[PDB]
């Protein structure tokens, strides 16, 4: 699915914030826990821990109803800045 | 406490809580009312206690 | 797998309706009547039949109360009754079936209409019944072009009666059961053609079926006193007497008609608001007794269990705790008054889910009304501080109107952590400071921070090393700032070392930065400098702050110099160092408006008394004159009350003189002087209403009218206008006023109580209607908008692809020069005349963003203009390095290759960052952009306008007329130019080109004032009058042509011989009025503007009559610049994008009045919404014939009414199926990013 040419070398802020949300649910059910499992060790701040991810090994796939599946690995592009 | 009356059955005589159990004579249900369950002129009745009750046999 | 994707209303599925049948009619009584008790009966009001009590055997569901979805059951009654809706249908359409034949609707035909119906969308088949609305049953039976005429039957509108005689028609009517027709023949003839959905047969009112008991609540008093229910359709069980069994059918349907036919809140709270600035900008705080509001998921995680059990042991009456925790086995257990618990097996007892209090965000939301921006409810932090206010950093009161009367405020509680993280890091730090509706910051020093910081900046204030105290609430301070501070050096070494007041403001010593600014609110030249502040890299060179250099300005701030370069997280943390630095300086200096702050000296009161004498003198002179006129008015044109404009501007001169006397001797150590030198609170026209002259009031941009005959107030003299008899106060609120200057104050005072009270008349509707009509707009990644059917609205955002989010300084070529000024790469010098080196850097530029491309079309369109800009920079540098250098190397004329490379990298960064789609959610932003700027401002914009005529016509309520495009618009004003570049006479000739005597008796009609009146008004002729009177000799009544009249040098219009001896009436009127003296044959007055604007003399034609093409023969012209101000007329007269541009500019005239400049791309988007199909049908508040738009807006008729019921009885679909229904229907959104398909 190499229809990935019509995105700026940045994911959008909406997609990035929502993927942070779904990673929140991931690390908030039991554990996909990552590079530091609970090195940041704090009480009930579920969201504010996986915000510090900076690697995010997961894939997200962005579309258009009259278009195909423009896919994107989180790794292969620049971040919120 | 608009203590009604009804045609056939009666609220008439039926005034008075004070079950008088052990804890709060009887309980924060009927803790601070009085001898006759009506009045309490000066008591910090608190947070969903009873100000007045009435068995309510209406119809 | 799949939730709702496409769902509409629900109905009776007869099978599952009637398997759950228990009882239809058990007896004459219900509710366990005859038992003399009420165990549970009778089998239909109980068990279930729809779960309307505490518990019983829920049918197909379980258990009580909810999740017992409405249970059905056959409760048939079989009372004879028919289709009341189709009673009305048969009455109206007059026997649409052509009973009693029901022959084929069409014959051959012309199959063209056949295939057209079969190959077109729905909501159209009504045309077949429309064709046969009348011809039905009155036609040739078994013929061509139709098959009806059978059998002589037309229906009578005798109310609900449908009487069908064998009509002639109109000759066979009877009165009492004869010549009737039965709806059973209609039913048989079923046994607009579509029985797949449109079946009138099965809707027979003989097998009536009931909605379940989930509609009806019964308040069983537990006392057998009142069990009322509503309505409902089952009630006809009590008609068992008549259940045993044409006018009879009407009686039955009349009996039927009695009882047959016609995201709110979660986890909230509200208290009063009184804030702190100790709460860091992102943080907020709530009361403490909101922790006593609970039942949160906070689903337990493995790393959390111990930290959760810490608070689990607390229970009902401790703040950091837990209560009502949801247990593993779906049976949640309480720790409230029945707690006596918290043994808490340490890993399993709540191994799934817990629920704590507000400890740390844990975000909460805050409500406001009206919610002007989307930034009236934002995302911000917690923890937790008491004293049940609504405290938050007081720099952000502007987008909330957190008004301080003590009127309460509403708090949310979000108890779901899915998009909560998404919400908290998208609308929490980027929503606050930057708005797309205006491009101006909302967060700003509201007040005294402005004056406290100003006073710091004042060149006077000299400080102490002992005044490192006030430093330390800022950068040696509360949480998240305790690094050191570099102690700005001892900026005096006199006999008296001292710390100037500026670099006590410019203080922070963690994460060093760089900045730049200019252009505060003062004049130009070193003029006691309160402007061109010229901040360098975090120091404060010159200047003194202001609302336009420390508050909600535009391009110079602590944001657009510390949001762009350097990023976020350094703007939300210089505002806090201000919030605790400056306003805890005033508490060591004090502001106190006494009285001497508002007393003018007794050495310049003169300048008010003598000017009062002079003013009243000249006004009296003119007012005397208007009876004799020696000066004189005429000019003015008019001149009756044009000794209004002159006296208005004389009192204006009076107030200007007075004001300027109110603002000269004010000694600079003054209050409100120091609350208008700094935009802080109030202006220079309020240090004048308190010192010299509060005059003059008005009413509607005009002095106080009468209201007693020819005099305003009775405490005056008749017919005598003056600066007293028509409101002109002259007493400053210091020496307050007189009872004929107060009652002319509460009548312009009653504007701001009617202005701000019918402001919420038009906005309350238009805001919700714009939101309801413009949701489907999306921003899918092809840089193109799409619609409900994915129809293209745009292709770029105007070539640039940009949207107003990243509107950095001028976009982005001037401020960034300063940005790279402040980080100095020293090594370089002028040796080679670096202009050529600048060209080499332009070459590395040309290379370094030809690797541009991505989601693109946003850089090449401006890459060459970038190049041109650096080329002109190089040219300016060449001129400077030549002339200025014709030795500090002329400051080295800094420019280096490193600086220009960094410059181009920053340019690329901001150009590629400001890129919308990908993203982008452009629709609702533009919707509210065009909406609420109609709500905020109406005060200082449409009333100055004080006071003059000549082309100031409308403001905000023109939005209504543009959106609706209603024909009742009373200002169809059509502007157009002329032989424009001319003099008054040169264009006046064409102006004249733009565009009355005794009727007699005894064989003669009339005459005309054909004398020089016309020859000095406009070029016409007696022959033109003859030609006009020849045209129908009248309007709308049959006069003559008469071929012809006017057989004399002055017209003799030959009243045509009295063939209609009825009237000399028309003979008089039809000639009396103007025929060749209207200039468009249907128009109100023309206009002329002999006005000197744009330097030269402009000349226009403000004609007020539809439509365009009125400017065909204005041989002026100026045809290139012909324009209009009415959308639907310019739709047909002129081009499509012509009307698009007129809609763009029309809503960009309602917003040029003072301040408000909404983004041009927003009105561009609205205009693109206007003209999907080209043929301009602008988005009206009631509906459009534009199928690529959203069909939801059609249903919003303001509001839903009986028409939907009538359409439902006709089997017609509803158009509420847009996306505003989604919030009531509770489904995920699917557009742009919500349409995931792996």
Curated annotation (Swiss-Prot), chain A:
Compartments (UniProt record): Nucleus; Nucleus, Nucleolus
Highest taxon, organism lineage: Eukaryota
Main location: nucleus
Keyword Acetylation tagged: yes
Molecular function, one GO term: DNA-directed RNA polymerase activity
Gene Ontology terms: biological process: transcription by RNA polymerase I; transcription by RNA polymerase II; tRNA transcription by RNA polymerase III
GO cellular component, as recorded: cytosol; fibrillar center; nucleoplasm; nucleus; RNA polymerase I complex; RNA polymerase II, core complex; RNA polymerase III complex
Keywords, sorted A to Z: Acetylation, DNA-directed RNA polymerase, Nucleus, Phosphoprotein, Transcription
Result, substituting residue 14 to N: In a breast cancer sample; somatic mutation
Family membership noted in the UniProt record: Belongs to the archaeal Rpo6/eukaryotic RPB6 RNA polymerase subunit family.
Subunit composition and interactions: Component of the RNA polymerase I (Pol I), RNA polymerase II (Pol II) and RNA polymerase III (Pol III) complexes consisting of at least 13, 12 and 17 subunits, respectively. Pol I complex consists of a ten-subunit catalytic core composed of POLR1A/RPA1, POLR1B/RPA2, POLR1C/RPAC1, POLR1D/RPAC2, POLR1H/RPA12, POLR2E/RPABC1, POLR2F/RPABC2, POLR2H/RPABC3, POLR2K/RPABC4 and POLR2L/RPABC5; a mobile stalk subunit POLR1F/RPA43 protruding from the core and additional subunits homologous to general transcription factors POLR1E/RPA49 and POLR1G/RPA34.
Function text: DNA-dependent RNA polymerase catalyzes the transcription of DNA into RNA using the four ribonucleoside triphosphates as substrates. Common component of RNA polymerases I, II, and III which synthesize ribosomal RNA precursors, mRNA precursors and many functional non-coding RNAs, and small RNAs, such as 5S rRNA and tRNAs, respectively. Pol II is the central component of the basal RNA polymerase II transcription machinery. Pols are composed of mobile elements that move relative to each other.
Protein name from the UniProt record: DNA-directed RNA polymerases I, II, and III subunit RPABC2
Species, as recorded: Homo sapiens
First-to-last residue of the parent protein present: 47 to 127 of 127
Curated annotation (Swiss-Prot), chain B:
Compartments where located: Nucleus; Cytoplasm, Cytosol
Top-level taxon: Eukaryota
Subunit comment: Component of the RNA polymerase III (Pol III) complex consisting of 17 subunits: a ten-subunit catalytic core composed of POLR3A/RPC1, POLR3B/RPC2, POLR1C/RPAC1, POLR1D/RPAC2, POLR3K/RPC10, POLR2E/RPABC1, POLR2F/RPABC2, POLR2H/RPABC3, POLR2K/RPABC4 and POLR2L/RPABC5; a mobile stalk composed of two subunits POLR3H/RPC8 and CRCP/RPC9, protruding from the core and functioning primarily in transcription initiation; and additional subunits homologous to general transcription factors of the RNA polymerase II machinery, POLR3C/RPC3-POLR3F/RPC6-POLR3G/RPC7 heterotrimer required for transcription initiation and POLR3D/RPC4-POLR3E/RPC5 heterodimer involved in both transcription initiation and termination.
Family classification: Belongs to the RNA polymerase beta chain family.
Role: Catalytic core component of RNA polymerase III (Pol III), a DNA-dependent RNA polymerase which synthesizes small non-coding RNAs using the four ribonucleoside triphosphates as substrates. Synthesizes 5S rRNA, snRNAs, tRNAs and miRNAs from at least 500 distinct genomic loci. Pol III-mediated transcription cycle proceeds through transcription initiation, transcription elongation and transcription termination stages. During transcription initiation, Pol III is recruited to DNA promoters type I, II or III with the help of general transcription factors and other specific initiation factors.
Protein name as catalogued: DNA-directed RNA polymerase III subunit RPC2
Organism of derivation: Homo sapiens
Gene expressing this chain: POLR3B
Range of the intact protein held here: 777 to 835 of 1133
From Swiss-Prot, chain C:
Cell compartments where the protein resides: Nucleus; Cytoplasm, Cytosol
Family annotation (SMART domains): RPOLA_N
Key words, A-Z: Acetylation, Antiviral defense, Cytoplasm, Disease variant, DNA-directed RNA polymerase, Immunity, Innate immunity, Leukodystrophy, Magnesium, Metal-binding, Nucleotidyltransferase, Nucleus, Transcription, Transferase, Zinc
Cofactor: Mg(2+)
Residue numbers bearing the N6-acetyllysine modification: 349
Tissues showing expression: Expressed in the brain, in the cortex and the white matter (at protein level).
Pfam families (alphabetical): RNA_pol_Rpb1_1, RNA_pol_Rpb1_2, RNA_pol_Rpb1_3, RNA_pol_Rpb1_4, RNA_pol_Rpb1_5
Cited InterPro entries: RNA_pol_asu (IPR000722), RNA_pol_N (IPR006592), RNA_pol_Rpb1_1 (IPR007080), RNA_pol_Rpb1_3 (IPR007066), RNA_pol_Rpb1_3_sf (IPR042102), RNA_pol_Rpb1_4 (IPR007083), RNA_pol_Rpb1_5 (IPR007081), RNA_pol_Rpb1_clamp_domain (IPR044893)
Residues reported to bind DNA template strand: 264, 270, 1181, 1199
Reactions the enzyme catalyzes: RNA(n) + a ribonucleoside 5'-triphosphate = RNA(n+1) + diphosphate
Annotated region (Bridging helix), positions in chain: 738-779
Spans annotated as Trigger loop: 918-959
Cofactor: how and how many bound: Two Mg(2+) ions are coordinated by both the catalytic residues and the nucleic acid substrate to enhance substrate recognition and catalytic efficiency.
Enzyme Commission number(s) of this protein: 2.7.7.6
Amino-acid positions noted as binding DNA nontemplate strand in the UniProt annotation, renumbered to this chain: 133, 156, 1035
Binding site for RNA: 368, 407
Binding annotation for Mg(2+) 2: 403, 405
Record-listed Mg(2+) 1 binding positions: 403, 405, 407
Assembly: Component of the RNA polymerase III (Pol III) (Pol III) complex consisting of 17 subunits: a ten-subunit catalytic core composed of POLR3A/RPC1, POLR3B/RPC2, POLR1C/RPAC1, POLR1D/RPAC2, POLR3K/RPC10, POLR2E/RPABC1, POLR2F/RPABC2, POLR2H/RPABC3, POLR2K/RPABC4 and POLR2L/RPABC5; a mobile stalk composed of two subunits POLR3H/RPC8 and CRCP/RPC9, protruding from the core and functioning primarily in transcription initiation; and additional subunits homologous to general transcription factors of the RNA polymerase II machinery, POLR3C/RPC3-POLR3F/RPC6-POLR3G/RPC7 heterotrimer required for transcription initiation and POLR3D/RPC4-POLR3E/RPC5 heterodimer involved in both transcription initiation and termination.
